[PDB]
From a paper:
To better understand the interaction between lonafarnib and the fusion protein, we co-crystallized [name] F in complex with lonafarnib. Electron density for the compound was observed within the central cavity of prefusion F along the three-fold trimeric axis, the crystallographic statistics are listed in supplementary table 1. One inhibitor molecule binds to each symmetry-related [name]-F protomer with an occupancy of 0.33, but for clarity only one inhibitor is shown as ball-and-stick model with carbon atoms colored in gray, nitrogen atoms in blue, oxygen atoms in red, and bromine atoms in dark red. Selectively, the lonafarnib-exposed virus population accumulated two coding mutations within the [name] fusion protein (T335I and T400A) and developed phenotypic resistance to lonafarnib and two fusion protein inhibitors (presatovir and BMS-433771). Strikingly, [name] pseudotypes with fusion proteins encoding the T335I or the T400A mutation or both displayed phenotypic resistance to lonafarnib, confirming that these changes confer resistance to lonafarnib. D Zoomed-out view of the F-protein homotrimer in complex with lonafarnib (sticks and transparent gray surface) highlighting residues, which undergo resistance-conferring mutations upon lonafarnib exposure (T335 and T400; space filling-models). Finally, we used surface plasmon resonance and confirmed that lonafarnib, but not tipifarnib interacts with a recombinant [name] subtype A pre-fusion F protein. Finally, when we treated Venus-GFP and [name] F protein co-transfected cells with ziresovir or lonafarnib, both compounds significantly decreased the size of syncytia. Taken together these results indicated that lonafarnib inhibits [name] cell entry via binding to the fusion protein and by inhibition of membrane fusion; this inhibition is overcome by fusion protein resistance mutations. Although these results do not rule out that inhibition of farnesyltransferases contributes to the antiviral effect of lonafarnib, these data provide strong support for the conclusion that lonafarnib binds the [name] F protein and inhibits F protein-dependent membrane fusion and in turn infection.
Residue numbers in the entry:
A (entry chain F), B (entry chain F), C (entry chain F): 26 to 69, 73 to 99, 137 to 518
Write the structure that this text describes.
Amino acid sequence: QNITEEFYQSTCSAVSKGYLSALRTGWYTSVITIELSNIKENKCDAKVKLIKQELDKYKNAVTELQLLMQSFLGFLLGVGSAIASGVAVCKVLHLEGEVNKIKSALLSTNKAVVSLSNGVSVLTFKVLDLKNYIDKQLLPILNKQSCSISNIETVIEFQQKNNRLLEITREFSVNAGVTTPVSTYMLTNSELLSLINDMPITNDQKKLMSNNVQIVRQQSYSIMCIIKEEVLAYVVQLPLYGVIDTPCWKLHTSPLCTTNTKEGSNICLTRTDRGWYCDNAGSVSFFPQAETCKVQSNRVFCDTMNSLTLPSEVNLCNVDIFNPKYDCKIMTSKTDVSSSVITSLGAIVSCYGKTKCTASNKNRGIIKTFSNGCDYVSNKGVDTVSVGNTLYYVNKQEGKSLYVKGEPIINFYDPLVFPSDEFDASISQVNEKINQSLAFIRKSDELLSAIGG
Amino acid sequence: QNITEEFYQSTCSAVSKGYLSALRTGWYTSVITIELSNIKENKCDAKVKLIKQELDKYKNAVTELQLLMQSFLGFLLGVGSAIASGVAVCKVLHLEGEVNKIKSALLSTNKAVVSLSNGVSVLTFKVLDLKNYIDKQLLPILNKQSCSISNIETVIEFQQKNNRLLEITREFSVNAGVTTPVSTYMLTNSELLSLINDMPITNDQKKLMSNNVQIVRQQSYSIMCIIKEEVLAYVVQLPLYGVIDTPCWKLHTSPLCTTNTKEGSNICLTRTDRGWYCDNAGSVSFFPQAETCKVQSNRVFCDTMNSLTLPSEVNLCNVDIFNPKYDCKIMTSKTDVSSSVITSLGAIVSCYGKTKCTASNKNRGIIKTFSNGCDYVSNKGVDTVSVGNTLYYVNKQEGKSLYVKGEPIINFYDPLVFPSDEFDASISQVNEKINQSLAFIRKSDELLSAIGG
Amino acid sequence: QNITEEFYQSTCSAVSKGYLSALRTGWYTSVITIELSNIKENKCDAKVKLIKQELDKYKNAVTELQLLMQSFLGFLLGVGSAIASGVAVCKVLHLEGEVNKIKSALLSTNKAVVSLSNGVSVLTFKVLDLKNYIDKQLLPILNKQSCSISNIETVIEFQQKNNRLLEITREFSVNAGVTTPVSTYMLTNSELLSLINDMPITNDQKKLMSNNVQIVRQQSYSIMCIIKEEVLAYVVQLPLYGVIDTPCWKLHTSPLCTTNTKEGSNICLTRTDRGWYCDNAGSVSFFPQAETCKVQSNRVFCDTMNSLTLPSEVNLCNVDIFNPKYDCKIMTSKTDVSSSVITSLGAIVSCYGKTKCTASNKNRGIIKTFSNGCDYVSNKGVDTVSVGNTLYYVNKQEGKSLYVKGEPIINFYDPLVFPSDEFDASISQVNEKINQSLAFIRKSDELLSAIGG
Ligand SMILES: NC(=O)N1CCC(CC(=O)N2CCC([C@H]3c4ncc(Br)cc4CCc4cc(Cl)cc(Br)c43)CC2)CC1
Ligand SMILES: [Ca+2]
Ligand SMILES: [Ca+2]
Ligand SMILES: [Ca+2]
């Protein structure tokens, strides 16, 4: 609805605002079941041969599931165990009587909340029943007609009912029993919508999940669990969006280098704090790898596992990078290569050396030839940006962008004492190394004065 | 046809030449459409039950698509927005009358160039027509026979026509409306070949794309766009290979360490400029992550978004790393671990410490025991290389390789003043830090002479 | 069976023991074949139209396969060429007579060991025969009935036989002839089990592969090779687990920072040697990217291509990080951000600044409020850990964990002379930089004493 962008010429960075949060903060685990016929040996025509081949497909899938059952700042992030919750629920299902308990609860209803032996109550869902189809609809037909089908529709009906089980088996077979995104075979759209509708979450959360079922699938896992007592069970671990509708901003950064003609005489700094930022419980959830988040219109879906919890003062780096409340993260170097960062509403261009950097229009061609340094163009009137031999299309989302003029902060650094190979550096750390270099010169020149006598 | 390789003993690096370029420089967006029946409520036998279940599959896919519609040096690279072009074309399709315009243009032909309201002319393709099948071939059969199919072939024919739509829906459902590579369901081989044949590109480009359809699919996107007025539309964003048949070379690098017996006394340097290099418009497109490129015989498919535009003088680093025209990139360390880099025509082996490094033959077993340091073997007579507990198979592509002897450049560095923890360093930067260290010793010893009196 | 874990308070790291190895050390390449009918023009009813459409699907797949045929410490790892072995075997299949040799060997048996012209003997497997089905079962039916099918079962039987070829074609079409994991369409479970059963490996290796078919698929490749003389051939490159049942341990590391109240006054160190470690041939195979390995109960599947061969003395870093036999790897910084590392049997928590860090229970909620610094909790009584706005579920695998108390080693470092921006650093390298800083102060103060007169 209302996306805005600000470019900071002094720090070669841009911020996009107007986004609303949808953050995965927890997990909800449901048990999905399929009823299976316990068939072993058949007592058997072209139509019967097709049924027996379909029965072999069914038997091999059951067998295969049984064997399957037993047998910049991303470096600062912690390490999670993504499916620890669903795997814990699955371990409980192996305990004596747990499967029979679910089989009894789902006897006449397709959905039921079941309390496991550990006190946890889970939503259980039966999505397919091949036990009643094979045992009470297919096998009695083969007996009353003494190995004759007659109706070809019987073959097609079994093929259609069996197909889902074969696809689920195929998926778990190539993914070692763990799949993500959760496919339509694991949970159809109506089953997922039905699951969200019964989840112990708010109406705003149900509305969000129901309107973004495709993002929910991407942020979910399906874990192959157990196959016993005529039951195939798998755990679908669904996201819990505990943080919704809080403001988010995306910070885009690009190298800021001096533009002196003398080769090997330039210095660079880059803001390393690029990423997604969302307000959350009085702090800011920072997602360094913005590519991990997913954007649907003005909504940003991020996962807290890919976040750092920072004080809201981190935003002051977008107001004044030399502020005293928060030590802004930067990296230093002497690598003045040319590149561009395509933002939400425009393009940051870092043009150095002899590189040809331009911004173009589909009707008029080149409309701007960038000069050396870090500049920006909005997507209004611009369709593409070219930096050397690389052409970038800009995003065409409607918004308002503001160019905040200012002298490149790299100009206020003495190149003689610049710490030019810092990566996990900050404004204060760079200043502390500069102070050490200046103090070592101060003490040397103090001795050269004292030695003059 | 004509691949050659040179190993540089002095810099522990190798270059493979003889490759021809195929670089993705731009994008071409086409609109792919499927005609849909606007069915809602049916007026209905084993065969009719199968048709009604197939109609539910059709209705749920349409519904699901409607909900889907609204809701070393890689760190130097810029950031693009890969589908900004296709998404821009899609936004235009939402404007009033755009869909009807395409529906009219494709009324009697399966392909038509349509001019959108923004002046852009796009290739439009209708790949499937379920509107005529369901409304004029399936529904009238159910009315004239008063809910009777009789012909089982009717069920199978509908199942075959519907299958493509269900697969496209399944794909967009697990990929949030954006897929890559573009599958055969999105665009069949003949549809892709037909699209390439009508693209506004040269005959050499059509021949290249047509002979590498499998690479074109990998470098393409399918973007779910709009579903309205009996039309399902999706944008297929295809690569534009603006740079073809220019020479390419792959640079392979490996750590070069001193081989002194005293533990903790060794120093290392590694060329960090490894990657793919292609001639392009008077400059060199450098692809640091060579794994992003795809090689088909002597043709290398790279994407300019994954490139740096460098002066052609970067190649001088393969002639003389101490050249004055280009400042060659290196990293320094004191981590003399053993490893191997499998090249196009051989293997670079960095053997340090007590590690067992060998090169073997399938008929004779071990044929070479590497000594400490950085050495190389060609794939002629060699099938595998082993460095410690790691066995590597070498590529068996036919070619000619040359061993360029020379003293390891790490031997000419004073270990006492070696800057041993530089990553984004170069030959000049390492020399500048060495000069500072030597000058600090010079001034200290000048004071020790002046203090002697 | 017997997983144990030790947390080291002094180094903010934990080790998990009790795992057994299954390491991919080599490759075994088999040739998989499909017999094809050489059909071109058909001499032809609703059932016959369905057969002719199925024949077009068959013809286009054959055509598409013919066009396909011609046209922290991970940075220390070497570079392999994963499919060099399978691609070498495939190149041999293109030589004159090689395909006919396999066609003759598989004439009456579905499996046969064939000796290629280069001396290599390979297991060959024919998984499907569409040549006999189309030429001797489908085409003669169309001739004797003068373009009449009569039996709808004929259409369904052809559709079922053809489906596998279309799926294999679809897979190679979207993966440029190279797929991984190897799907059930490339090799069914019984074909893979049959292949393992005939591989030239031990009974323990066959038992391991057969019990972990899903891991074998993940560590295998299918390479589209040649289509000629009524034969479709593809190479399935299978893992060789040359190292099995040797002990493995997983090392989990997290930042260890001082906890002083003064902002910007803290220093950090982190053990960078996190990863999987397996005993192997008298050395230790180290897998820095533990995420590359796969764990099935107490078995860890790793690939030697993702390993460093280290002396077994690397384990001494878990006994005493200041030991004289092995120089332990660490990184330094002044970035005291809060994070958690979920281990096999618990959670390491690095809590700094004003961050709220807790460990919770499903029955009692919060059961521990972490203090500043690096602490640990076991999974006994703990279900989740929260560090700021990030909630982590802990693994619930049964095991015994031990807390080894000790003063944080970061406390024994003088913050004034701490080298705080080292990444590829070690205990000795950090000590050497500290010595240089202390010696520069020593010589300055020696001159200030000599200048007093
Ligand atoms: N230098 C640090 O203190 N880092 C914190 C931990 C982080 C984790 C990591 O493995 N990496 C590797 C890549 C990065 C890192 C890097 N990468 C590879 C190698 Br060999 C050495 C270096 C060391 C510092 C450097 C400096 C610059 Cl100019 C750019 C980068 Br991209 C890097 C960060 C992530 C690496 C960077
Ligand atoms: Ca682009
Ligand atoms: Ca190999
Ligand atoms: Ca979790």
